[PDB]
């Protein structure tokens, strides 16, 4: 777990995608997914609906966020669709006057540690959630509200680690949650904000390595209420401070030589730990699942027709789909299938009769050659 050696010195509505893991066949078991992403703050209520009522047993992934600090979650459950059943996803968020309902329509390597602290004045201590990733696969989690109060495994290949690993990781993620709790009280005072408001502090930490496994880039950055706070620059020698409050943190961390400590850890322990994980999970992390591609042609009228280019079951999540006009293409965000693979599609409305003139360009590292269909 990352070190975090020193203490300190907005609203986005969720994007909702409801879909099945595999193509829906009546009477065949499947998985109903609701992927919410690109929202801030983190608190969100997501429900899966079937024939006008809530599906009682629904699981969800651990809270994480993208590079732009926006959160994403996957709500999922097993189901068997029939001809009569109608399914939808209901999402409640501070950005919505009422819950929104969406109906169901039938290489290099990196390690990251993400953390989110959400204050809840009057309702006790802030909620701290931390997750760890290798490429696009999560392997550890910690929830300060959980009964275990331990770093928990979230990937099969991390269960190999002995008790000394889990003792060390739990104590370090616990110390981080206390540091970020004190940081929340510091940011409250520096910005002269009321004590009755809820605030969010996010942190990101990790390293990049190339194909040879040697160090490439290192990262350590903070976000407060969805806005950049402080960030370690690319040279791992100085900081980027967003506002005057963060400039106080920058000068404090400069005198303590925090950048020198983070640079040594990023180029050392982070790379050594990422190299170990890539080996133990070789059959998982060092695999390349190529996309299962297919195209659909269904007209929306007699004037126009819609062509959708599908890509299914690929890993990692990086992919590129193109038909070149970028203003006439609908491009959904890459979504997880729930089994470790990812999905994406590209659509374009097209004058009827000119279907055989359009082609889809598929780019993925799991393909020896980029496909054209």
């Amino acid at each position: 777990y990352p070190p975090v050696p020193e203490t300190f010195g907005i609203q986005r509505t969720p994007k909702i995608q409801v879909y099945s893991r595999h193509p829906a066949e009546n009477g065949k078991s499947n998985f109903l997914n609701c992927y919410v992403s690109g929202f801030h703050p983190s608190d969100i209520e997501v429900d899966l609906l079937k024939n006008g009522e809530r599906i009682e047993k629904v699981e969800h992934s651990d809270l994480s966020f993208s590079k732009d600090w926006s959160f994403y979650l996957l709500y999922y459950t097993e189901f068997t669709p029939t001809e009569k059943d109608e399914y939808a996803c209901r999402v409640n968020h501070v950005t919505l006057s009422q819950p929104k309902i969406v109906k169901w329509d039938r290489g290099s390597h990196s390690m990251r540690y993400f953390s989110t602290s959400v204050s809840r004045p009057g309702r006790g201590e802030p909620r701290f959630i931390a997750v760890g990733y290798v490429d696009d696969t999560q392997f550890v989690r910690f929830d300060s509200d959980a009964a275990s109060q331990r770093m928990e495994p979230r990937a099969p290949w991390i269960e190999q680690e002995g008790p000394e690993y889990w003792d060390e990781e739990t104590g370090k993620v616990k110390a981080h949650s206390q540091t970020d709790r004190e940081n929340l009280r510091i940011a409250l005072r520096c910005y002269n904000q009321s004590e009755a408001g809820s605030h969010t502090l996010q942190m990101m930490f990790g390293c990049d390595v190339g194909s040879d496994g040697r160090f490439l880039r290192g990262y350590h950055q903070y976000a407060y209420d969805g806005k950049d706070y402080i960030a370690l620059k690319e040279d791992l020698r100085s900081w980027t401070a967003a506002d005057m409050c963060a400039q106080i943190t920058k000068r404090k961390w400069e005198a303590a030589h925090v950048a020198e400590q983070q640079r040594a850890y990023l180029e050392g322990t982070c790379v050594d730990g990422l190299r170990r994980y890539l080996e133990n999970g070789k059959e998982t992390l060092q695999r390349t699942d190529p996309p299962k591609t297919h195209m659909t042609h269904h007209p929306i009228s007699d004037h126009e027709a819609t062509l959708r280019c599908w890509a299914l079951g690929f890993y990692p999540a990086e992919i590129t789909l193109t038909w070149d006009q970028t203003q006439d293409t609908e491009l959904v965000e890459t979504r997880p299938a729930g089994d470790g693979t990812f999905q994406k599609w590209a659509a374009v409305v097209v004058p009827s009769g000119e279907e055989q003139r359009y082609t889809c360009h598929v780019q993925h590292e799991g393909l020896p050659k980029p496909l054209t269909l």
Partner: nanobody, 115 residues
């Protein structure tokens, strides 16, 4: 299509109790889930309690054990028994229903005030 008639509410002191009711007008088997959301001081509304035609219910965490929801399917009417009311329970409570095709309907709301 579907009309939701709300009634109840009022003005009460802390520790007091209040009732709510909401009836659905239209087709007999037109509505599945019925319940209440309440307006936060901000923009969003939070779930208070709802119940399906089969009796499955869910409560918001802040009202569990204090509020109790019931339903009469023969009249398409739900009832909300609120006890141990607190000032933070003061809000406009919107009744809502869900069609079997997952279409939502909303009442105009009913005011509840606790000192």
């Amino acid at each position: 299509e579907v009309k939701l008639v709300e009634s109840g509410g009022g003005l009460v002191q802390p520790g007091g109790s209040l009732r709510l009711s909401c009836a659905a007008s239209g087709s007999i088997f037109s509505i599945n889930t019925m319940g209440w959301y309440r307006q936060t001081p901000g923009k969003q509304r939070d779930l208070v309690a709802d119940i399906s035609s089969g009796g499955s219910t869910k409560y918001g965490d802040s009202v569990k054990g204090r509020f109790t929801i019931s339903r009469d399917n023969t009249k398409n009417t739900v009832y909300l028994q609120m006890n141990s009311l607190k000032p933070e329970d003061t809000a406009v409570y919107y009744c809502y229903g869900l069609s079997y095709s997952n279409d939502d309907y909303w009442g105009q709301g009913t005011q509840v005030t606790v000192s």
